[PDB]
Amino acid sequence: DFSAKVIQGSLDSLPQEVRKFVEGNAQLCQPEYIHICDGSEEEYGRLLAHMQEEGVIRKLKKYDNCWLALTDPRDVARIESKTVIITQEQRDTVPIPKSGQSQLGRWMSEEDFEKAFNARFPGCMKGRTMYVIPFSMGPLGSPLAKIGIELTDSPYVVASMRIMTRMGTSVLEALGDGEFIKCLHSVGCPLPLKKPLVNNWACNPELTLIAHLPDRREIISFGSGYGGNSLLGKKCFALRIASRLAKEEGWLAEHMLILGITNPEGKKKYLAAAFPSACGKTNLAMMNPTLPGWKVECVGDDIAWMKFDAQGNLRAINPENGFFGVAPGTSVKTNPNAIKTIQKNTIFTNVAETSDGGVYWEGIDEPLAPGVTITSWKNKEWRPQDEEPCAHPNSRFCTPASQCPIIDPAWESPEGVPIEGIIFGGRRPAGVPLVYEALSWQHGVFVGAAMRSEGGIMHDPFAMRPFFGYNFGKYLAHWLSMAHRPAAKLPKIFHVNWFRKDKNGKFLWPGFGENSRVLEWMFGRIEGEDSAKLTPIGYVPKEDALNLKGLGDVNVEELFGISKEFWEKEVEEIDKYLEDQVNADLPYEIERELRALKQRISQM
Template identity: 60%
Template sequence: MSDNEEEPFMEVHEIVTQKLGHIPVAKGDFKKLPSKVQKWVIHSVNICQPRAIYICDGSKPEADEVTHKLLERGTLTKLTKYEECYLCRTDPSDVARVESKTWITTPEKYDTVPHVREGVKGILGQWMSPHDMKKEIDERFPGCMKGRTMYVIPFSMGPIGSPLSKIGVQLTDSNYVLLCMRIMTRVSPRVFEFMGDHDFVKCLHSVGCPRPVERKVINHWPCNPDNVIIAHFPEERKVKSYGSGYGGNSLLGKKCFALRIASVIARDEGWMAEHMLIMSVTDPNGKETFIAAAFPSACGKTNLAMIQPTLPGYKVQCVGDDIAWMRFNSKGQLRGINPENGFFGVAPGTNFKTNPNAMRSFQKNSIFTNVAETADGGYFWEGLEDEIDKNMSITTWLNQEWRIGKAGTAAHPNARFTCPASQCPIMHPKWEDPEGVPISALIFGGRRPTGVPLVLESFSWEHGVMIGACVKSESTAAAEHKGKKIMHDPMAMRPFMGYNFGKYLDHWLSLKKDGRQMPKIFHVNWFRVDEHGKFLWPGFGENIRVLDWIIQRCQGKDIAVKSPIGYLPKKGSIKMEGLKDPVNWDELFSLPKHYWLDDTHESTRFLEDQVGCDVPEVIMKLLKEQEESFKKM
């Protein structure tokens, strides 16, 4: 199938002859762009050689125009059951973040990656020298947009004008990316009003399919999977992505900017850019507490951020479900914002039982990628079997006929929904407050089937950093890893580190200063199972019971006992009334000695192997003390 359908053009009204080499500006006024943006666009045009430039404004008419063209082309299918919802099926070879092809480039290697043990393959970031990266870039980007339009997308990560926000400009030849960036970030020419002398993050993206297209285009989804590269240049505040049109590979405001580049900016400016949700919990007395929590992808961040509490009198509100930017203010209080404007959530497993608020969020104005379609114009994925007619005819993400009960799966395991955060029924009124919200607790967690208790509190800020450095979880469908195995994902940032992880831990440790109100640090594990593989904790809305305990600890309540790994809840201090099934407290909070000796040793070895001499001494000291505590048991 060819890929030479017409791009969505408005009437060409300007040609900037001298600067752009007769490239037509299909929409917008190039001369109104800030001069430094003009220079970068001109530089990129000369390399990528698009046939036209389209300066985006993020407006509804713009989105309608692009959507209409993508419907005509077949890239999008309208889901007629809902208001302004669309389905996209990608090329099956372009369905996930491609971590193996994601690189950081700095002049000094160990600015990017730690000193790993000799003979060990490092997993905390990938470095490529500027010389080698230039070669890779030069083999891909020249002429990569021939026959296509270059979309110029001005966007803000965080509320426009907030002192906690940052500005980016993405250049892309994918109009699907434009539609998704409009949901996930704040796309508006207003960002230029706040640019002034400040830097902006330069984001260049191409699907890598100049016309005439040589590779067969599948599902009207141009891509170049054999030549994918996602390159980050933190010192230049720049990202270049080639070959993939999917998710975090192409929506460069997300993981690339908001975590990898922003973590470097945060280090340089003294704040935190983290893979964390932000939520608030208001107790029956009206006391509100804001919490940030870091879990590896597909481990329930969105579910927790939008939890529907089962305990009477409690109210949860969402600030963000994936990324948190946090900074101490002049009063020493940690304030956080969600830099994103939308949700890019994993669809399979999401339903009205697991996450009713997410379901209500994407009933309109949403894009669904690699989900299945029902005969009546609705979406479907694994987890929705109880919510549709069992005899309903379904078309899978691979465009094959399917019914519930038939072999195989209907949706890709990493199928996604993309929807505006403003549509979430429990978004906090202050979710766009330019000053951010006050953070009282930080939570780490992961999928740990054995050994790890439901909840624990760190002894100190330093101990909490150690706990974060030792986060592990079953692997997920968000990346290209296959099968289930326990993987290290320190701070839930393993795929998203923008610089040397040892220096990142140093940065966390350095944040503790006199006069600052340091949040308490916790670890949770909803996923512990018994000997029969059954979950020991019901999870979902019942997790409010654990959050309640965490909040009480933030308020100084004496409801904890010391253990070798941190403070555990005193027996009976978590509210259990009203649970459908009894919970085995002793098993849920047991600390098997040999398990923890092995786990502590393995965590120590991981840090020695992967971070080496860059590990802060205090982290290794705390692990040694933990090991000695278990030996004495």
């Protein structure tokens, strides 16, 4: 009975199973206090002032209610090598690669995880508050939403979870005696500190471990205070645990933005798009379109949960409540919609601070008034001349989604939005056209399976490489199975590449807002317009089908050129990759698409 240690709320008012989860872990971790979060502005405002007084965060005096946290340089990112999924059988979690280690996940035995847990959690919250965060992933009470409870000893996690999820008393009220995902987090620095605290940022890099136990609906994370390791709704819940549940239950949990696009005729369509890192995701989600009379609005910028409704529509929700975006590169010039979003009520992590109490980072493209100086994310004076960057490359804004000037009016609709197109993206200086369209659902799944990360060297199928909750081959089979659902209205699948270059190393396409022109083509293709030419790789825009008005001389022949020798090498590369990494778990349909593509190229 830990009743005597409760400093907000009451163990008595919690649902039975929630109380068991709290108390059981209070027994294990030995926190000094238990704070049951209410999600109120009062609670939030006071928690921030507290962190401020303690030096954990600084207030950003130039803005309305914005804050800056600077971490221990050892704890600056989601850490893949410490991220594991626990299942009875390794093969259910990752395929067995022909040689070496899987690139598609990282399994740990139940036995090894048990030893790891015992080595970390007993007594780990001594002298700290355990916060109890009741949170909804997705609009509160939506049939597509799922509830979690996160226990944490980090006020930073509490504040960031309030922005990134729906959290507080109303969630407990909606949960009742229902099922929830159990989320346990600790920074792993019980008091009295065994080791020096760096930058007022509690962490334990040596023992950092982020574990997922899908059969137990548990996520357990130790030693990192940061982002994807500590905000458990984001990746651990909404991709890793969720993709497994989606597999079980017949839906999809994906690393996709969701956008709503309206043509000049006022007709609106929703599209989902998966991109690997540095391939253009945030710029597309926040697009300020250049074509007159087009509108682009954002439902979500990172994760999508999608489920076919009774009518066969693939309905998607954004399970998040906020944007947890990479700050560097967010440009006042070319990403105005992100910039507007983050002007108030935003928590920044590891960015630079200007002497007038503003934020700064590489690629902001905003000259400072003469006189204004810059303090780096390492708390050192900094000048544009310097060797090291002023902001960590993985530094972040954490901002409420409702503040996005282009947030879609249906971004919280409980039944989700009807997805009519899915886009897979990449970054290839050569050989891959600006846009092409899959020949079929099965071809589309192959195209997602063949995705590469920036530069085209490494594979990031479906932009899910770090995030698969289970065996990737089985994931492909799951996608392929959607085709056999009666009445399913299967979205059209496209692949985009903003980054193709000419022989000089210059981009052949201007991109950014100009990508509205590619959306226009996709939109028309969904409506059944005859604006496509068949090629060995799929459909591409016909001559003159793209609106190039205003762009001057665009070399569409090169931008859309398909080379036999390039595509021969590409098919051989995909073949090798799928054999090595997926092998016995590769679906028949995928192998069949590989053979079909190889054959179409061979006839060039």
